[PDB]
Amino acid sequence: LVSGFEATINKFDKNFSAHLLDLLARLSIYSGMASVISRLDFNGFYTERLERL
Amino acid sequence: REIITLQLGQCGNQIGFEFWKQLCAEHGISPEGIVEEFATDRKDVFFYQADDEHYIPRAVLLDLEPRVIHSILNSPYAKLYNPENIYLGNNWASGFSQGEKIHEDIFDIIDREADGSDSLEGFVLCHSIAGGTGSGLGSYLLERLNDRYPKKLVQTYSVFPNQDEDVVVQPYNSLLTLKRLTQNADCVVVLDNTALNRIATDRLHIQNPSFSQINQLVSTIMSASTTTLRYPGYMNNDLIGLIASLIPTPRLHFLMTGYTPLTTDKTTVLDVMRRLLQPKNVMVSTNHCYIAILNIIQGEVDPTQVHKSLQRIRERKLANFIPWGPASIQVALSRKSPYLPSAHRVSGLMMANHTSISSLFERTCRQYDKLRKREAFLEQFRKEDMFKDNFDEMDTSREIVQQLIDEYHAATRPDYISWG
Amino acid sequence: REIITLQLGQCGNQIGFEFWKQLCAEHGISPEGIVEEFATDRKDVFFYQADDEHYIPRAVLLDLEPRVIHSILNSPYAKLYNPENIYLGNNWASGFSQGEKIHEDIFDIIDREADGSDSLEGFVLCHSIAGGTGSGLGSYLLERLNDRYPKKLVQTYSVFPNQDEDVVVQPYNSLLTLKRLTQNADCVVVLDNTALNRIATDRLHIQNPSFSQINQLVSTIMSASTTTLRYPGYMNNDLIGLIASLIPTPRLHFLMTGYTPLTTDKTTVLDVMRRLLQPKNVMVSTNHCYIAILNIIQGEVDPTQVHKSLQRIRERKLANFIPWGPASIQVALSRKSPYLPSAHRVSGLMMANHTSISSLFERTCRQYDKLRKREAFLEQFRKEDMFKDNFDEMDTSREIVQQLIDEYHAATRPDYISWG
Amino acid sequence: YEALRHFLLMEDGEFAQSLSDLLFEKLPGELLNPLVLNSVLSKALQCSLHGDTPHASNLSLALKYLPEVPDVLSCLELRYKVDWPLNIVITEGCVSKYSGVFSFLLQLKLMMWALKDVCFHLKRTAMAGSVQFRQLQLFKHEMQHFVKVIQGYIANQILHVTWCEFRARLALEEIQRAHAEYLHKAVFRGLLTEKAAPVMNVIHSIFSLVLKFRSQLHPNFALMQQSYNTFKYYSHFLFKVVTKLVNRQPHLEDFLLRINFNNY
């Protein structure tokens, strides 16, 4: 639960973080208005960390 | 689904008595259980549809040196709940050993009510930490419940033992009970006795009947927390959904209590949100940061109000954040209950996972460390000696609570790929 | 932005009480704080939108030998403001030492209200110079405020200690307090007790209740000065903009008070401008020349009237000029307040930096020099001896006020590339 | 009308003290995405407590050029979209000129922001009583005073006189021409005309010296004293040029009085 678990989990985590960043980024260009992204990540981390324009 | 509520000890039977009386007044039932004509609801969460047209709650009645439980006996709310399972102190070791020798038939009592309901969601324990009567027996029964049924939830409504207090074995008892709470529970709801005492001596000018008024507070909080289960919503009509967001990991499962009116004896969502976020409308009184907050509101709520209120809460930043992730205050809306008094028409409560409770834990640990270093405050209790002649359980509990404090401080960090 | 008002001493709590009552009557609130139906405004400058639908002002209540503060307690305006921070004479040394030993929790009171508001613009101190109760504690708290927070503004509404007066240590107390005022304040608003006494004995025929009527005057002036902040204009919706033009340098920060009706118990801007410029509609009574004047008017003002009035003020030359630069009387227009009595519909007030206050300073310096040369009027106060056995603070304050007088006279010169 | 007076010409308070103040933290390498300037107006209207009205809805704050050049230049227009049955009265060619005069007023706030910067940078030193403290703040005060008297001039013309008119002309073809004259007086009394171009030309020179005075903050005192004296010579010339352009106004009679008052 620490070693093979970590190996299976981290590829899921990489894919989920990828699949989360591109959605919040592709919604952040569209401008509630920008409240949709703003509520989904209240922290503002993975909200758009790979800014576009 | 359905919740079976367990009450034990004099303080635990006191808070269960006031909670059952509160839900009796709340729902459309007499103290006998006679149906009313005004009752989107549910009456099958704490109540069995029982077999004399009284919605008899599934409650386990446990007594240990009964004084106030006798007063519970000759009462009009003894016609509401009595499935006739009453079966017989000032120490954790005494209550633990007494619970140990008779675990069989009280487990049969648990089995009877477990067979009683069709479905089950969790076990809510009316418990008092280092209350003497509740202590020891509560920790032992917690071990019995979590070992015997690994598929259900265990909830423990707990007080923090500071009542401006004589008992000097109380840090040892609270430390052993806290070891059981960290290891044998899925979630723990903790309150401070001193915080509720300060709030009660604030809102009124009462000094002597503090116990009964604190009972009113915890019963109102317990009704408010399960309103979303008792009244059908969209989420947290099961316990595990409300339990899920606040608890990020099996070690941090201790939840702060908030409720934005301290009053029941005009208003909007926006004002009660900003009124909730202060630590002096919290009923539990370096960098200290919440892991996750969840608030549930009940009233005549305009749906745009929660939206712009959460806007204001964001750009003001009046809540303490989580470094390692997003886990924030979540707006939940619930139905206003029938036959509740019409003050604070928009009323909300919050449950939150905060690292500030680590301070209270290490304070009690410091008290234990002081009395343990002095070695004059074990008092040589005979059950404490016979239970453990080497007293290594105190060392194990100290290690577990130290790991707990370290994991708290590690969750405080921006890295929680560093553990404890 | 938001102003947190501090009141201390019996005279300071008196003027704060009348000012809060004046703003309660002015804005649409009850003495409890109940909202009215008639209220371009703002109610967030002195008022917090507080949490029982009363716009409770952020006021620090300080008491030292309370007599009139007890009367403030049993009052209908004690339901307007009481955040419950009241915490406990005839000398500067006694009030200074008493403020010194308890600076911690009163600084926590300051910290509580500083955390209370979202934004902050300045600290307005209700203060009386050599008032005994206000004295010493006010100077010490001025040191605490300016040292602890260097990013905000400090304002001190001050009286000049001449009430046709027995206290002979009063020049020493006023000299030490004036040292603190010159060194530990960003701006000081000074009034003369004898000037307001003359105006009060003029407009009525009162001799005994002079204190309360003077309180009416200073409260009206304090409301009039912050009308442009409380009602949204275009400039001086922050304190520092009004503070900026009158103060050319950190040593000359003492402002004269003017207000063109002495009456509230037809009119144009042109007449009230020429009526304002005389030194006997000034409520503070060689070449003496203003550094900078600023006037604010409130009423039914035709916008051409201020234009040709300022034309007349130029070619008449009825104002005292500044040699080293341009810094002149500036016309500001503000909104007429709701629920103010309809006398003098066009009403203006002025704040001005004048070198004539150097005369009052050197008069009090001459009184101090007389009593200091005689060496019979220290009275051997024990707190004065224990605070400074050598009494070198009196010499340092004398040096600072002498440098102040020299800088005043140097600003009077056409060269202010010659300093003091 | 009384809404655009509050926002597009700024009569709402701690709105001008909030919108420009939040924008000017970026100035440029920032204020390029329309995702922070598109959101800051919605945060300013909450911070004024006269906002969130449905007439402060459809307020679009957008640029027409991307600046790749603080900076006193501005290319930002605050707009409003008029609905259908009032579009026959107010057209959306008038609102563009409201944005046009807005741009100069916003550039004016940029001066009292950079002067606020250098007044705040010196404020943390004081307590302090050095020669270098008092005699440096002496330079600052005259420079801020210049802006506050020319701001008082704008704060007379575009807000007090021209608001008293076009309320004496609303007390259907006439309404369009009434509005078109209300607009026409604002650029004429504002001295943004090509007629008053030489009196406007010196204001930019003063503004460049203010930005350089903010740039410095000590051994370089003499540089700042030199800049202050060059500023004072330029003001001494402006006082005569404004007087010469009265031979060429009623509204200009304020400005020579505003800029110097009893000094030749």
Swiss-Prot record, chain A:
The record's account of tissue expression is: Ubiquitously expressed.
Transmembrane portions of the chain: none
Tell me the first and last residues of the signal peptide.
none
Where in or outside the cell it occurs: the entry states: Cytoplasm, Cytoskeleton, Microtubule organizing center, Centrosome
Linked disorder reads:
Cortical dysplasia, complex, with other brain malformations 15: An autosomal recessive disorder characterized by global developmental delay, variably impaired intellectual development, speech delay, facial dysmorphism, microcephaly, and varying degrees of cortical malformations including pachygyria, thin corpus callosum and subcortical band heterotopia. Most patients have generalized seizures.
Q: Which family does it belong to?
A: Belongs to the TUBGCP family.
This chain's function reads: Component of the gamma-tubulin ring complex (gTuRC) which mediates microtubule nucleation. The gTuRC regulates the minus-end nucleation of alpha-beta tubulin heterodimers that grow into microtubule protafilaments, a critical step in centrosome duplication and spindle formation. Plays a role in neuronal migration.
Summary of subunit composition and partner proteins: Component of the gamma-tubulin ring complex (gTuRC) consisting of TUBGCP2, TUBGCP3, TUBGCP4, TUBGCP5 and TUBGCP6 and gamma-tubulin TUBG1 or TUBG2. TUBGCP2, TUBGCP3, TUBGCP4, TUBGCP5 and TUBGCP6 assemble in a 5:5:2:1:1 stoichiometry; each is associated with a gamma-tubulin, thereby arranging 14 gamma-tubulins in a helical manner. Gamma-tubulin at the first position is blocked by TUBGCP3 at the last position, allowing 13 protafilaments to grow into a microtubule.
Protein name, UniProt field? Gamma-tubulin complex component 2
UniProt organism field: Homo sapiens (Human)
Gene this protein is translated from:
TUBGCP2
Swiss-Prot record, chains B, C:
Gene Ontology process terms (BP)? cytoplasmic microtubule organization; meiotic spindle organization; microtubule cytoskeleton organization; microtubule nucleation; mitotic cell cycle; mitotic sister chromatid segregation; mitotic spindle organization
Task: Kindly list the positions annotated as binding GTP.
Answer: A130, G131, G132, T133, G134, S135, G136
Q: What molecular functions are annotated in GO for this chain?
A: GTP binding; identical protein binding; microtubule nucleator activity; structural constituent of cytoskeleton
Gene3D superfamilies referenced in this protein's UniProt entry, alphabetically = Helix hairpin bin, Tubulin/FtsZ, C-terminal domain, Tubulin/FtsZ, GTPase domain
The UniProt similarity line reads: Belongs to the tubulin family.
**Noted disease:** Cortical dysplasia, complex, with other brain malformations 4: A disorder of aberrant neuronal migration and disturbed axonal guidance. Clinical features include early-onset seizures, microcephaly, spastic tetraplegia, and various malformations of cortical development, such as agyria, posterior or frontal pachygyria, thick cortex, and subcortical band heterotopia and thin corpus callosum in some patients.
- Protein name per its UniProtKB record: Tubulin gamma-1 chain
* Record organism: Homo sapiens
Swiss-Prot record, chain D:
Membrane-spanning intervals of the chain = none
Where does the source fall among the domains of life? Eukaryota
The subcellular location is: Cytoplasm, Cytoskeleton, Microtubule organizing center, Centrosome
Question: What is the annotated quaternary arrangement, including any partners?
Answer: Component of the gamma-tubulin ring complex (gTuRC) consisting of TUBGCP2, TUBGCP3, TUBGCP4, TUBGCP5 and TUBGCP6 and gamma-tubulin TUBG1 or TUBG2. TUBGCP2, TUBGCP3, TUBGCP4, TUBGCP5 and TUBGCP6 assemble in a 5:5:2:1:1 stoichiometry; each is associated with a gamma-tubulin, thereby arranging 14 gamma-tubulins in a helical manner. Gamma-tubulin at the first position is blocked by TUBGCP3 at the last position, allowing 13 protafilaments to grow into a microtubule.
Function, in words: Component of the gamma-tubulin ring complex (gTuRC) which mediates microtubule nucleation. The gTuRC regulates the minus-end nucleation of alpha-beta tubulin heterodimers that grow into microtubule protafilaments, a critical step in centrosome duplication and spindle formation.
Similarity comment: family membership: Belongs to the TUBGCP family.
Protein name as annotated: Gamma-tubulin complex component 6
The organism's taxonomy opens as: Eukaryota, Metazoa, Chordata, Craniata, Vertebrata
